Amino acid sequence: DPCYEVCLQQHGNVKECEEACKHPVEY
Numbered sequence: 001d002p003c004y005e006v007c008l009q010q011h012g013n014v015k016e017c018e019e020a021c022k023h024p025v026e027y
Contacts, residue, residue, distance in 0.1 A: 001021075001023065001025055003021040003023045004017070004021060004023070004025070007020060007021050014027065
């Protein structure tokens, strides 16, 4: 996913990153 990668690029794992990406994808 674009959001996830962008996040991951300079962020931790899912958990917080998820809440920040606000993208309810397949985990």
